Design a protein around this nucleic acid. Structure first.
Ligand code: ADP
Length: 964
RNA sequence: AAAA
């Protein structure tokens, strides 16, 4: 805190006037900043550098009667003057309106446009919006291509790439190409696709970039400006319509703590006190939140969860409550009957729908990819119409069209599998929490996050409190990619690596990254600590002893040692694992808890036993039914010592035992009333009067008879480490607090410096380059290309495989080797099912009919993985083999034989929505392999893939829109 | 294992 300001907290009005000309501070505060910057095209010669200003007027010449705010004005104005523009703002900013102008601008003078979306499901929704608006619109997806000759086109990012590599003529006729949610280029699988598309695109194409808030937004335009020789504008705004307050919910905790104030203030104590809660360690705790926020009037509330599976469970436990009124009760199934006419009688009885119908009546929504496109769309409608006050959604919901709420809850702070157990990045936080805070009902937005972690916390602060993260290119080499680049003569695989956004980052980052280090080095040098050395050897050995004594009590707490010393009435010292002391006590009874009901994994023997122990603590009096946590929820005698002081038998876990007494107190059989328990307390108090310095402890060595070589070692390193603490200015003054507080930042920055040091190592990283030589060797060895590394016939059908990434070689190998021709069309379709999707499926079929072809295409993977691994790449022999799924082979095959859709989902646990997804994509692998056989010269396998394709196509499995 |  140096120079900063503070908004008016709750409600205020700053101005007033009378009768002629006022000054408007009216009903908005405080959302302020906007930004406009322009990237410029590089100059060819020294001889001439033109300096070209363009500052476009606020309100354009013709607004087409459309409604526009000051922000979207210059976004439109940039397109109006016909130049590329980047709009980076929250999904609340209304970015869609500028996309409709760009198309309308082109349609006005009658030329062609391409609209694109990260996701095909969202592409279809925007299509029917565009078609019903303009009418000259048509969509090309993989599955369905409708009206391709239309001026405006809605297509998958996958399709847009496939036409460029194949050099479609339609790209010569396209003026503008609109990319939406481009900040999702981060995706480790399909994010590389966005870069491949952009770089290869014609230089005369004008661009529109619709993105969330990103720090490097200007850096992105530089990269577009340099490779395309264009002037690319940047329109960026940080404003959001509603203030945001952040509450932390500790795991197992009984409440929420406010970490971030509405004005941005970060509470350190709430953060620290929250961490005290998590040392006390399937949580139903979400059912509690949704319960009270109904009564606290926080609605609607969007609960974000990153798994399809556990997402429905948190909806199930909350299904025991009903938040809807009778007028809302019958309104949801009155609007539910419209989609029945759009469905078949067999499909209207579908199992998924019969579950959700009573659920929506209770006012509980659910949104994810495992849902039917018609069913999830009604749920999307019902939310923004206000008939659903509680929604359990996945990350995809935050990517889609604006559908804001009053509350946003983060259930999990860790993120996905692909390369890392990855803490939640800042960009995802801004995007999801941006859903909170609608216009006129919210004084404030409410954001709740549950926090537990798997190594060390300092990260946990950095997510919300710290800075944002760079938008990192996920660009990486691929088999399908290197062949497509080696395919066209005009371009080499090295050409794309040059213009890839990852290279553009590193080149411009490193000279600046050098200044990042020297500025960091000044601060740690600018801090001057008296006796800079001795302290490093105090804090150094401070964390050394505090850590190694934890290893001593841990062995003692283990039943191997302490258990034999458990006797009724033995004096016991109880201190919670968090470090809070419940005071002394006396052992009443010890019992091992055996065989819990089901859910939680069986107990480790450290926490296994349960010790009933008499303590003088107080707090919420009841909890005799005791949570599996360490203790009933109490409060030690810091609290009300008047309202309660009672010696009470407390069922403490075994890890709460830090010491044992030397002698035991005689105990009766029953402590029930206050009399029976208070009498034992005086028996304890008597011991305290005779032992002022402390109560004698059983010596772990001699008294408890622990001779272990590992125990002796730890205990010997305990003694000598204690002696080092006395050799420092520990005694005769405790000023170490001021030293540690100043020295703490020195180590934080020092650790922060080492990262910036290793940051340069990753800027100069050769991973892309070294992979290419190693990857092109297996292309030569497997026979895909020659010794001169020139394309061969096999590589021409491998460039035709798109929809499937990673089996591109396997599929190319099997097809060229004359495999699918020895089979039947139904068999050909069920075999290609293994490649299409990686979601787990449970059914039991080892049936030898489909096991024979599966084992063969599986063995071929081992052949591929054999030479590819010793080529100095990294792939395991087992991992790649198992990347194909046999659990769905029975399922898809049944649909091809003309069995009803309803029975199909009864064979497996596959989502009815996910089943649609893997079919439509399987459908496209067929259409792509139809072209693959067409290049090979074998036209019998073309019809083979076409006759198979015809059996996956029917009336009700094709449902999007029917217009023109 | 989330998203296409
Ligand atoms: N000038 C404006 N100020 C505030 N809200 C607006 C404005 N224009 C549109 N909106 C509303 O804000 C929401 C965001 O619009 P939209 O463009 O659909 O979101 P996205 O940017 O995700 O496409 C819309 O529901 C719209 O009604």
């Amino acid at each position: 805190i140096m120079t900063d300001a503070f908004q008016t907290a709750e409600s205020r009005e700053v101005t007033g006037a009378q009768g002629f000309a006022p000054t408007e501070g009216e009903s908005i505060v405080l959302s302020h900043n906007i930004q406009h910057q322009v990237a410029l095209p590089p100059d060819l010669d020294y001889e001439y550098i033109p300096l070209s200003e363009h500052k476009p007027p606020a309100e354009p010449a013709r607004t087409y009667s459309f409604k526009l705010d000051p922000f979207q004005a210059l976004s439109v104005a940039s397109i109006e003057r016909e130049e590329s523009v980047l709009v980076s703002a929250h999904t609340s900013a209304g970015k869609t309106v500028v996309a409709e102008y760009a198309i309308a601008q082109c349609l006005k003078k009658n030329q062609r446009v391409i609209y694109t979306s990260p996701i095909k499901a969202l592409s279809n929704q925007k299509y029917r919006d565009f078609q019903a608006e303009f009418g000259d619109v048509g969509l090309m997806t993989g599955d369905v291509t409708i009206n391709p000759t239309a001026s405006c086109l809605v297509m998958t990012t996958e399709i847009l790439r496939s036409m460029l590599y194949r050099g479609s003529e339609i790209m010569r006729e396209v003026a503008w190409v609109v990319f939406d949610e481009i900040h999702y280029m981060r995706d480790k699988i399909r994010g590389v696709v966005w870069e491949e598309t952009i770089i290869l695109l014609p230089d005369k194409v004008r661009y529109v970039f619709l993105s969330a808030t990103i720090p490097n937004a200007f850096q992105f335009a530089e990269w577009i400006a340099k490779i395309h020789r264009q002037a690319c504008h940047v329109v960026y705004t940080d404003f959001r319509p509603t203030p945001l307050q952040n509450y932390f919910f500790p795991a197992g905790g009984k409440g929420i703590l406010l970490i971030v104030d509405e004005k941005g203030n970060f509470k350190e104590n709430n953060f620290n006190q929250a961490m005290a809660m998590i040392e006390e360690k399937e949580k139903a705790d979400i059912a509690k939140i949704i319960k009270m926020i109904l009564k606290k009037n926080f609605q609607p509330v969007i609960v974000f969860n990153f798994s399809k599976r556990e997402c429905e469970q948190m909806a199930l436990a909350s299904s025991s409550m009903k938040f809807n009124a009778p007028d809302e009760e019958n309104m949801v199934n009155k609007v539910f009957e419209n989609a029945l006419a759009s469905l078949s009688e067999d499909d209207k009885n579908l199992p998924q729908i019969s579950n959700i119908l009573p659920l929506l009546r209770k006012g509980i929504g659910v949104h994810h990819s495992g849902l039917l496109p018609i069913l999830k769309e009604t749920i999307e409608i019902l939310f923004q119409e206000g008939l659903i006050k509680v929604l359990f959604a996945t990350e995809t919901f935050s990517i889609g069209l604006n559908m804001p709420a009053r509350t946003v809850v983060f259930t999990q702070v860790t993120k996905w599998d692909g390369q890392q157990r990855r803490p939640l990045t800042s960009s995802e936080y801004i995007q999801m929490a941006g859903r909170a805070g609608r216009r006129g009902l919210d004084d404030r937005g409410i954001v709740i996050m549950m926090v537990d972690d798997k190594l060390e916390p300092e990260t946990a602060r950095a997510i919300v409190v710290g800075n944002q993260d760079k938008l990192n290119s996920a660009f990486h080499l691929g088999y399908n990619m290197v062949l497509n680049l080696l395919r066209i003569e005009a371009i080499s695989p090295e050409y794309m690596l040059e213009r890839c956004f990852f290279q553009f980052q590193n080149a411009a980052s490193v000279p600046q990254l050098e200044r990042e280090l020297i500025s960091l080095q000044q601060e740690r040098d600018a801090i001057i600590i008296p006796d800079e050395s001795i302290v490093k050897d105090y804090y150094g050995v401070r964390q050394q002893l505090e850590e190694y004594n934890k290893d001593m009590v841990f062995v003692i707490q283990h039943p191997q040692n302490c258990l034999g010393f458990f006797q009724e009435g033995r004096l016991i010292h109880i201190k919670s694992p968090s470090g809070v002391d419940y005071g002394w006590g006396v052992l009443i009874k010890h019992i091992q808890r055996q065989t819990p009901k089901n859910g939680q994994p069986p107990y480790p023997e450290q926490e296994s036993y349960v010790l009933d122990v008499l303590l003088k603590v107080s707090g919420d009096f009841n909890p005799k039914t005791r949570g599996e946590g360490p203790m009933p929820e109490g409060i030690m005698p810091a609290g009300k010592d008047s309202k309660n002081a009672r010696w009470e038998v407390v069922p403490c876990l075994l890890n709460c035992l830090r010491a044992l007494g030397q002698l035991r107190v005689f105990l009766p059989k029953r402590l029930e009333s206050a009399d029976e328990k208070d009498g034992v307390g005086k028996a304890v108090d008597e011991i305290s009067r005779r032992f002022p310095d402390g109560i004698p402890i059983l010596d772990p060595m001699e008294n408890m008879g622990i001779n272990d070589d590992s125990f002796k070692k730890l205990l010997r390193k305990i003694e000598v480490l204690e002696s080092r603490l006395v050799a420092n200015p520990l005694h005769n003054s405790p000023l170490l607090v001021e030293l540690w507080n100043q020295y703490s930042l020195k180590m934080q920055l020092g650790e922060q410096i080492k990262e910036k040091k290793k940051a340069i190592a990753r800027a100069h990283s050769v991973a892309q380059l070294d992979e290419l030589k190693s990857r092109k060797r297996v292309l030569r060895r497997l026979g895909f290309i020659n010794d001169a590394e020139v394309v061969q016939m096999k590589a021409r059908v491998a460039c035709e495989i798109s929809s499937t990434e990673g089996h591109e070689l396997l599929l190319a190998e099997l097809l060229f080797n004359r495999f699918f021709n020895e089979l039947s069309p139904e068999i050909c379709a069920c075999i290609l099912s293994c490649f299409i999707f990686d979601e787990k499926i449970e059914t039991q079929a080892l049936k030898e009919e489909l096991a024979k072809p599966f084992r063969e295409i599986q063995a071929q993977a081992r052949i591929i993985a054999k030479v590819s691994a010793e080529s100095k790449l990294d792939v395991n022999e087992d991992e790649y083999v198992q990347s194909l799924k046999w659990q769905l082979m029975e399922t898809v095959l049944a649909w091809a034989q003309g069995r009803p859709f309803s029975e199909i989902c009864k064979m497996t646990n596959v989502y009815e929505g996910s089943l649609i997804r893997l079919f439509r994509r399987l459908e496209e692998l067929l259409r792509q392999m139809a072209e693959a056989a067409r290049v090979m010269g074998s036209e019998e396998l073309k019809d083979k893939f076409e006759l198979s394709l015809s059996k996956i196509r029917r009336d009700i499995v094709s449902f999007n829109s029917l217009y023109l």
